Write an enzyme that holds these catalytic residues in place. Structure first.
Site, PDB file in Angstrom:
ATOM      1  N   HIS A  40       0.294   3.360   3.406  1.00  0.00           N
ATOM      2  CA  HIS A  40       0.830   4.043   1.911  1.00  0.00           C
ATOM      3  C   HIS A  40       2.160   5.055   2.833  1.00  0.00           C
ATOM      4  O   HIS A  40       2.860   6.054   2.024  1.00  0.00           O
ATOM      5  CB  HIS A  40       0.077   5.144   2.071  1.00  0.00           C
ATOM      6  CG  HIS A  40      -0.837   5.988   2.658  1.00  0.00           C
ATOM      7  ND1 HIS A  40      -1.976   5.260   3.191  1.00  0.00           N
ATOM      8  CD2 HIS A  40      -0.447   7.092   2.935  1.00  0.00           C
ATOM      9  CE1 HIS A  40      -2.419   6.594   4.772  1.00  0.00           C
ATOM     10  NE2 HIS A  40      -1.256   7.556   3.404  1.00  0.00           N
ATOM     11  N   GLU A  71      -4.426  -1.266   5.628  1.00  0.00           N
ATOM     12  CA  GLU A  71      -3.839   0.083   5.538  1.00  0.00           C
ATOM     13  C   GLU A  71      -3.109   0.365   7.099  1.00  0.00           C
ATOM     14  O   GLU A  71      -2.810   1.976   7.109  1.00  0.00           O
ATOM     15  CB  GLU A  71      -5.114   0.783   5.797  1.00  0.00           C
ATOM     16  CG  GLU A  71      -4.860   2.370   4.767  1.00  0.00           C
ATOM     17  CD  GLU A  71      -3.224   2.064   3.377  1.00  0.00           C
ATOM     18  OE1 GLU A  71      -3.730   1.029   2.636  1.00  0.00           O
ATOM     19  OE2 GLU A  71      -2.534   2.354   3.015  1.00  0.00           O
ATOM     20  N   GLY A 145      -2.819  15.574   3.032  1.00  0.00           N
ATOM     21  CA  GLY A 145      -2.004  15.611   4.547  1.00  0.00           C
ATOM     22  C   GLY A 145      -2.600  15.167   5.266  1.00  0.00           C
ATOM     23  O   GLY A 145      -2.076  16.187   6.481  1.00  0.00           O
ATOM     24  N   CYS A 147      -3.770  12.129   6.716  1.00  0.00           N
ATOM     25  CA  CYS A 147      -2.942  10.837   7.327  1.00  0.00           C
ATOM     26  C   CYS A 147      -1.702  10.763   8.126  1.00  0.00           C
ATOM     27  O   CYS A 147      -1.638  11.137   8.048  1.00  0.00           O
ATOM     28  CB  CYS A 147      -2.898  10.006   5.734  1.00  0.00           C
ATOM     29  SG  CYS A 147      -4.193   9.549   4.088  1.00  0.00           S
TER      30      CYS A 147
HETATM   31  C1  LIG Z   1      -3.680  10.705   3.248  1.00  0.00           C
HETATM   32  C2  LIG Z   1      -2.610  12.105   2.222  1.00  0.00           C
HETATM   33  C3  LIG Z   1      -1.862  12.037   2.975  1.00  0.00           C
HETATM   34  O1  LIG Z   1      -2.014  12.790   4.491  1.00  0.00           O
HETATM   35  O2  LIG Z   1      -0.848  12.030   2.257  1.00  0.00           O
HETATM   36  C4  LIG Z   1       0.123  12.688   2.504  1.00  0.00           C
HETATM   37  C5  LIG Z   1      -5.043  10.999   3.000  1.00  0.00           C
HETATM   38  C6  LIG Z   1      -6.138  11.979   2.311  1.00  0.00           C
HETATM   39  C7  LIG Z   1      -7.392  11.663   1.464  1.00  0.00           C
HETATM   40  C8  LIG Z   1      -7.541  12.274   0.332  1.00  0.00           C
HETATM   41  C9  LIG Z   1      -8.493  13.343   0.681  1.00  0.00           C
HETATM   42  N1  LIG Z   1      -8.906  13.323   1.733  1.00  0.00           N
HETATM   43  C10 LIG Z   1      -8.169  12.900   3.157  1.00  0.00           C
HETATM   44  O3  LIG Z   1      -8.433  12.573   3.806  1.00  0.00           O
HETATM   45  N2  LIG Z   1      -5.278   9.702   2.353  1.00  0.00           N
HETATM   46  C11 LIG Z   1      -5.259   9.484   0.947  1.00  0.00           C
HETATM   47  O4  LIG Z   1      -5.019  10.038  -0.140  1.00  0.00           O
HETATM   48  C12 LIG Z   1      -5.549   7.523   0.713  1.00  0.00           C
HETATM   49  C13 LIG Z   1      -4.663   7.057   0.117  1.00  0.00           C
HETATM   50  C14 LIG Z   1      -4.635   5.488   0.081  1.00  0.00           C
HETATM   51  C15 LIG Z   1      -3.869   4.658  -0.700  1.00  0.00           C
HETATM   52  C16 LIG Z   1      -5.055   5.069   1.126  1.00  0.00           C
HETATM   53  N3  LIG Z   1      -6.240   7.954  -1.087  1.00  0.00           N
HETATM   54  C17 LIG Z   1      -7.619   8.179  -0.630  1.00  0.00           C
HETATM   55  O5  LIG Z   1      -8.574   8.514   0.510  1.00  0.00           O
HETATM   56  O6  LIG Z   1      -8.889   7.795  -1.968  1.00  0.00           O
HETATM   57  C18 LIG Z   1      -9.773   8.397  -2.090  1.00  0.00           C
HETATM   58  C19 LIG Z   1     -10.626   7.624  -1.636  1.00  0.00           C
HETATM   59  C20 LIG Z   1     -11.541   6.245  -2.779  1.00  0.00           C
HETATM   60  C21 LIG Z   1     -12.147   5.658  -2.208  1.00  0.00           C
HETATM   61  C22 LIG Z   1     -12.844   5.747  -1.552  1.00  0.00           C
HETATM   62  C23 LIG Z   1     -12.408   6.182   0.018  1.00  0.00           C
HETATM   63  C24 LIG Z   1     -11.377   7.480  -0.071  1.00  0.00           C
END
Ligand SMILES: *[C@H](CC(=O)OC)[C@@H](C[C@@H]1CCNC1=O)NC(=O)[C@H](CC(C)C)NC(=O)OCc1ccccc1
Length: 180
Positions: A40, A71, A145, A147
């Site tokens: 992403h 991913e 933030g 990832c």
């Molecule tokens: C990525 C944020 C980042 O660095 O953006 C600059 C992280 C964070 C998550 C969200 C809160 N806890 C974390 O560590 N990942 C995401 O935001 C991902 C994005 C996808 C496109 C991969 N989404 C996410 O975590 O969704 C929540 C979720 C839903 C269902 C199952 C597990 C998690």
């Protein structure tokens, strides 16, 4: 303790802070000019890496033999400095440990480290509406933030943080055969 000391040494050597048009991320260099970002992050033809513009020579959005999302995005950087070969720290299959740390290096979390504790092979996960596989799971309230953070135990690089709900964290396993 030992997993913490190993992370600090590894991030000083191989990690950098990367900005794409989609946000700021921790990036881990693997070998030669190949590094890894979460899918992403969506890197364009040029990225900002340690606040300087770096061209992207190739980008591979990783996918399993049936096309299932992993991913992970692998990019070759148009730069002269080679990464320290850490492929020996990459396992051949999804790693489980009892004590791991998540390490992060962005402007919002500069060299921040994380006691995720136990890491287990999770497997399939509907991650943001996308079926994804080879996930590693830890019980830590991980934040946005974060990832791109590098999941490690002592002597091991387990994967790249890609998501989390409120009180769980999920990493994409960083496997050896991804880089030849
Ligand atoms: C990525 C944020 C980042 O660095 O953006 C600059 C992280 C964070 C998550 C969200 C809160 N806890 C974390 O560590 N990942 C995401 O935001 C991902 C994005 C996808 C496109 C991969 N989404 C996410 O975590 O969704 C929540 C979720 C839903 C269902 C199952 C597990 C998690």
């Amino acid at each position: 303790g030992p997993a913490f000391e190993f992370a600090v040494a590894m991030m000083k050597r191989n990690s950098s802070t990367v900005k794409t048009e989609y946000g700021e991320f921790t990036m881990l260099g693997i070998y030669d000019r190949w590094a890894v970002l979460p899918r992403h992050a969506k890197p364009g033809p040029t990225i900002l890496m340690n606040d300087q513009e770096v061209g992207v020579l190739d980008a591979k959005e990783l996918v399993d033999k049936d096309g299932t999302n992993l991913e992970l995005t692998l990019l070759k950087l148009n730069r002269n400095e080679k990464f320290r070969d850490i492929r020996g720290f990459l396992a051949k299959e999804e790693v489980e440990v009892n004590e791991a740390v998540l390490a992060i290096n962005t402007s919002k979390f500069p060299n921040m480290y994380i006691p995720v504790g136990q890491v287990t092979e999770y497997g399939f996960l509907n991650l943001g509406g996308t079926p994804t596989k080879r996930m590693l799971m830890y019980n830590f309230p991980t934040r946005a933030g974060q990832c791109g953070g590098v999941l490690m135990s002592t002597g091991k690089v387990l994967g790249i943080h890609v998501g989390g709900n409120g009180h769980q964290g999920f990493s994409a396993a960083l496997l050896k055969h991804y880089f030849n």
